Amino acid sequence: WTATSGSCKGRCFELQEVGPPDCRCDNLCKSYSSCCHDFDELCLKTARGWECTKDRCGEVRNEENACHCSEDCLSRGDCCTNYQVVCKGESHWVDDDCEEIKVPECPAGFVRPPLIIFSVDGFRASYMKKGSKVMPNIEKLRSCGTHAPYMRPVYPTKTFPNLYTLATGLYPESHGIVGNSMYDPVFDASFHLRGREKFNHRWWGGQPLWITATKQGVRAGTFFWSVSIPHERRILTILQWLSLPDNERPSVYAFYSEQPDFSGHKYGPFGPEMTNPLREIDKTVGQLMDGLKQLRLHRCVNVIFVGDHGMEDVTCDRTEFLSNYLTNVDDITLVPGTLGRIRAKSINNSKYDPKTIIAALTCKKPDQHFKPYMKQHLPKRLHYANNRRIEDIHLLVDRRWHVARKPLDVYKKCFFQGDHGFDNKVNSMQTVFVGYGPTFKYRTKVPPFENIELYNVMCDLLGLKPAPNNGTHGSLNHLLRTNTFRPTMPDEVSRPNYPGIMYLQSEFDLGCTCDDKVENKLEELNKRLHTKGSTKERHLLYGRPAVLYRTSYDILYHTDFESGYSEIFLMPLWTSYTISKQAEVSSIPEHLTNCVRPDVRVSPGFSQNCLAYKNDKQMSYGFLFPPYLSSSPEAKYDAFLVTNMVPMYPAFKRVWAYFQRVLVKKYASERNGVNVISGPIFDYNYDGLRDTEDEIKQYVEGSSIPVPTHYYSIITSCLDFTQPADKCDGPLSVSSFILPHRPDNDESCNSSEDESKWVEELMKMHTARVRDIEHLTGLDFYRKTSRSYSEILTLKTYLHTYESE
Numbered sequence: 001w002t003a004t005s006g007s008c009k010g011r012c013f014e015l016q017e018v019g020p021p022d023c024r025c026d027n028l029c030k031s032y033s034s035c036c037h038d039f040d041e042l043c044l045k046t047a048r049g050w051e052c053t054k055d056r057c058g059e060v061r062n063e064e065n066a067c068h069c070s071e072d073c074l075s076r077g078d079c080c081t082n083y084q085v086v087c088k089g090e091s092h093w094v095d096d097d098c099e100e101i102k103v104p105e106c107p108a109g110f111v112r113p114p115l116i117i118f119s120v121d122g123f124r125a126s127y128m129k130k131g132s133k134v135m136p137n138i139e140k141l142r143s144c145g146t147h148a149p150y151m152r153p154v155y156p157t158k159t160f161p162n163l164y165t166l167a168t169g170l171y172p173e174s175h176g177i178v179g180n181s182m183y184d185p186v187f188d189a190s191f192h193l194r195g196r197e198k199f200n201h202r203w204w205g206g207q208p209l210w211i212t213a214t215k216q217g218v219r220a221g222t223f224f225w226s227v228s229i230p231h232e233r234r235i236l237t238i239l240q241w242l243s244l245p246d247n248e249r250p251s252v253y254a255f256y257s258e259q260p261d262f263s264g265h266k267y268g269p270f271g272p273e274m275t276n277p278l279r280e281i282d283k284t285v286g287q288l289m290d291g292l293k294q295l296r297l298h299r300c301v302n303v304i305f306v307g308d309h310g311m312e313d314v315t316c317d318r319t320e321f322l323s324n325y326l327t328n329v330d331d332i333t334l335v336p337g338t339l340g341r342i343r344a345k346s347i348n349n350s351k352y353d354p355k356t357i358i359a360a361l362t363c364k365k366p367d368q369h370f371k372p373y374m375k376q377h378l379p380k381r382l383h384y385a386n387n388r389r390i391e392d393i394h395l396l397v398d399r400r401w402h403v404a405r406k407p408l409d410v411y412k413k414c415f416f417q418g419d420h421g422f423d424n425k426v427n428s429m430q431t432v433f434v435g436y437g438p439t440f441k442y443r444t445k446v447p448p449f450e451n452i453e454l455y456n457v458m459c460d461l462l463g464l465k466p467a468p469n470n471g472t473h474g475s476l477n478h479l480l481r482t483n484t485f486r487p488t489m490p491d492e493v494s495r496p497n498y499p500g501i502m503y504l505q506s507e508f509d510l511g512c513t514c515d516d517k518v519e520n521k522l523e524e525l526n527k528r529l530h531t532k533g534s535t536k537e538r539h540l541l542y543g544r545p546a547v548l549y550r551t552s553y554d555i556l557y558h559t560d561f562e563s564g565y566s567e568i569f570l571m572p573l574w575t576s577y578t579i580s581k582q583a584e585v586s587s588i589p590e591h592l593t594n595c596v597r598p599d600v601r602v603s604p605g606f607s608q609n610c611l612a613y614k615n616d617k618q619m620s621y622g623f624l625f626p627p628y629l630s631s632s633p634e635a636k637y638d639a640f641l642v643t644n645m646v647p648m649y650p651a652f653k654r655v656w657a658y659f660q661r662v663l664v665k666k667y668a669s670e671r672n673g674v675n676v677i678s679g680p681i682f683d684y685n686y687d688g689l690r691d692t693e694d695e696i697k698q699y700v701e702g703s704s705i706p707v708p709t710h711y712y713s714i715i716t717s718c719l720d721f722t723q724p725a726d727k728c729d730g731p732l733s734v735s736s737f738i739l740p741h742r743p744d745n746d747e748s749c750n751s752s753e754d755e756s757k758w759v760e761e762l763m764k765m766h767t768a769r770v771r772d773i774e775h776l777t778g779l780d781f782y783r784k785t786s787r788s789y790s791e792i793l794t795l796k797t798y799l800h801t802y803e804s805e
């Protein structure tokens with residue numbers, strides 16, 4: 001209940017929220033149906049519009065007007081944004097030449113440059129170039145400030161997940177806003193765009209910027225604007241707040257535009273009807289900048305122009321229906337559209353089986369436009385699993401398509417021509433970033449980066465300590481003139497052992513065999529030196545990775561590769577090797593096909609054994625350093641060491657063998673050598689973080705050999721590919737993957753064909769950042785390069801996407 005007969009007199013857009021049943025004049029009052037009786041009259045004035053005209057110049061103040069053209073308006077902070085242009089012969093901000101802002105030029109009493117976040121819903125990245133002729137204000141921001149060619153949103157590429165990611169630096173799985181619609185089974189409650197339940201604070205995890213600010217003594221303007229408040233009024237409210245006295249004035253502000261998303265849904269991303277919404281957004285930017293200029297803040301405020309996601313062409317006719325696949329279609333609930341999420345209609349139905357639903361949705365039609373996944377099998381780059389609000393069954397929908405339960409759901413709801421929500425690496429979902437101000441760089445282009453990184457930077461811009469988040473603080477230092485955060489490398493927690501030869505052959509009883517009994521002082525000293533690390537500079541180019549948790553491991557040196565061998569997991573945590581452009585691929589000789597060799601540096605008790613694999617009818621093995629890339633017949637024996645073996649399902653060995661036999665050499669040819677680091681990952685609870693021993697759910701039968709959930713590789717070369725990988729003087733280039741270790745290739749519908757038609761496609765889908773691997777392994781890479789640490793942090797957040805331009 002609201003006693004709406006209090007008044008908003010002198011309280012319009014009050015920052016502090018007053019408590020029911022006392023009536024509200026703050027922004028959200030509309031959304032709670034709680035504004036005071038006179039809120040529209042006092043706070044939403046529209047009289048005479050939003051622009052001064054010559055005849056109004058120096059008028060007598062009339063408090064009914066939406067904005068003012070009277071001599072006292074500047075000191076009141078409530079002039080129309082074009083007041084100085086119309087009435088004082090000033091230029092619009094957009095018509096002024098741009099001039100470097102070397103230092104903040106702020107009015108007295110400003111403690112720090114304010115930050116304004118100008119967020120635009122549905123603003124696809126390519127609009128910056130394709131719409132540049134109709135967006136002069138935005139184009140000046142872009143060209144004069146710091147910009148990326150695009151910014152990667154998070155998955156799903158929907159509004160609230162992305163704007164709340166911007167606010168918190170967290171993946172949706174951690175912040176809790178995992179789509180625009182959700183069911184939380186602990187709460188037994190549903191979150192929707194419509195209605196009121198979405199304002200309940202239990203939906204919203206982490207700590208958004210406005211709370212981070214407030215807790216640290218920095219005042220914040222509103223981040224949420226009610227849909228009925230027009231854009232001109234949002235801008236005027238921000239400008240008025242900026243005119244407050246020093247002790248009352250916020251330091252961080254947000255503007256939000258529902259456009260171009262609103263029109264994009266109706267008309268498609270490049271519909272002719274899209275030109276107007278872009279013109280209008282640009283006009284709004286013009287109003288803000290003119291307003292800032294009038295208040296002498298245009299060379300003081302840092303402005304971020306940022307989108308939440310892009311927009312793709314999507315129509316009703318490109319809809320797949322689950323009713324064409326499942327018989328039981330009324331036993332399920334689908335969250336539909338540009339992604340699919342499936343759960344049981346009733347928890348009382350114990351005849352509901354996820355395995356049979358997945359199988360009925362897998363590779364059933366030749367051009368099928370969605371792919372089902374148990375959430376733990378989604379590409380790890382999506383970070384979309386560790387939340388009870390994300391249903392176990394997920395459908396990744398192809399760009400340009402929808403999924404629905406039944407046809408009736410589409411015509412009892414063609415209207416729309418645009419949508420978004422798809423995989424966050426899809427080009428059409430990419431959105432925009434521009435930063436303009438004293439703290440940003442001048443006329444600077446930066447590479448594309450992920451929106452999870454911005455929270456840290458916004459905290460840096462405001463002198464705030466960020467709450468714990470998924471950004472990598474320092475990775476965006478290259479955007480900034482000053483206020484950089486100077487991170488240090490994490491300390492190594494576990495130092496390795498360096499074992500020598502400590503065991504005789506006959507101490508091992510592993511059930512392994514190798515045809516290797518084949519016998520020189522020239523080559524005897526030479527092989528001793530390889531085992532003490534004489535080739536390690538060739539194979540370990542960026543130093544050894546640091547182990548950031550407590551464990552027991554050994555460094556093992558060899559002619560062609562170096563490894564960090566875990567005594568706890570009985571396999572390497574990592575294996576490092578360099579393949580030059582010139583290297584030759586060879587086969588596994590006939591006599592070595594089943595060869596596994598005890599490693600006399602490592603006890604039997606901390607070794608794998610061949611008998612376990614013999615007895616485990618589902619599990620085979622592979623090697624981390626590939627025998628195919630041995631430098632010589634003699635060196636090839638090292639590749640068959642039991643310490644280089646890892647457990648692999650035969651179906652996965654098809655993938656791994658093609659990667660090692662064909663792809664590594666291809667990449668060395670294309671990139672002028674590559675350094676490769678490969679290893680296992682264990683993420684049985686799908687939290688994106690390294691498992692401890694006691695979290696492992698599967699072992700090679702009858703043994704303590706833990707089975708990885710995934711295998712990674714990090715492939716590094718010289719960005720200047722005219723230099724070979726192993727003699728690179730400058731910046732590096734990386735691509736990585738985290739392949740799911742699956743007992744079938746059901747994910748790849750064309751897997752009956754030759755690996756050349758499907759393996760690389762799988763690997764592209766599971767592309768990853770080095771940082772993703774770091775989380776999953778507790779390893780810290782690139783510890784010894786000639787590069788700055790901030791540059792290395794940037795490299796570690798790079799994602800190789802495999803989209804064209």
Ligand SMILES: *[C@@H]1O[C@H](CO)[C@@H](O[C@@H]2O[C@H](CO)[C@@H](O[C@@H]3O[C@H](CO[C@H]4O[C@H](CO)[C@@H](O)[C@H](O[C@H]5O[C@H](CO)[C@@H](O)[C@H](O)[C@@H]5O[C@H]5O[C@H](CO)[C@@H](O)[C@H](O)[C@@H]5O)[C@@H]4O)[C@@H](O)[C@H](O[C@H]4O[C@H](CO)[C@@H](O)[C@H](O)[C@@H]4O[C@H]4O[C@H](CO)[C@@H](O)[C@H](O)[C@@H]4O)[C@@H]3O)[C@H](O)[C@H]2NC(C)=O)[C@H](O)[C@H]1NC(C)=O
Nearest residue numbers: 173174175176204205206386387388468469470687688775
């Ligand atoms: C991305 O960045 C984020 C942020 O840094 C990373 O997330 C952190 O990961 C940590 C490890 O997974 C995690 O630490 C745990 O926190 C527990 C306390 O948590 C509460 O308080 C914090 C701080 O204010 C708060 O942020 C949390 O908020 C979560 O939950 C509410 C809903 O209840 C949501 O509003 C919110 O969205 C958020 O949900 C997300 O996180 C939780 C896990 O915390 C998930 O379950 C959800 O799915 C969702 O993703 C909390 O309200 C603390 O109690 C834990 O301690 C246990 O583990 C330690 C290990 O040191 C052990 O020693 C203890 O014994 C203890 O175990 C006991 O409880 C067990 C479980 O009940 C039980 O089995 C044992 O037997 C014991 O009794 C732990 O320290 C941290 O909370 C989150 N933070 C956030 C914001 O998510 C994330 O990892 C990064 N991602 C990547 C890929 O790097």
Ligand SMILES: N#Cc1cc(-c2cc(OC3CC3)ccc2F)c(OCc2n[nH]c3cnccc23)cc1Cl
Nearest residue numbers: 117119159160163164166167223224225226254256
């Ligand atoms: N950084 C950031 C940032 C966060 C938000 C946001 C606000 C929120 O407010 C609580 C009361 C729900 C919650 C989550 C958010 F992510 C945001 O919201 C703009 C918005 N105003 N009006 C809309 C209508 N629909 C969708 C979004 C908005 C804009 C930005 Cl720049």
Ligand SMILES: [Ca+2]
Nearest residue numbers: 121122159308
């Ligand atoms: Ca949106």
Ligand SMILES: [Ca+2]
Nearest residue numbers: 683689690691
């Ligand atoms: Ca884990």
Ligand code: NA
Nearest residue numbers: 613616617619
């Ligand atoms: Na086997």
Ligand code: NA
Nearest residue numbers: 745746748751
């Ligand atoms: Na298949």
Ligand SMILES: [Zn+2]
Nearest residue numbers: 122261265420
């Ligand atoms: Zn939309």
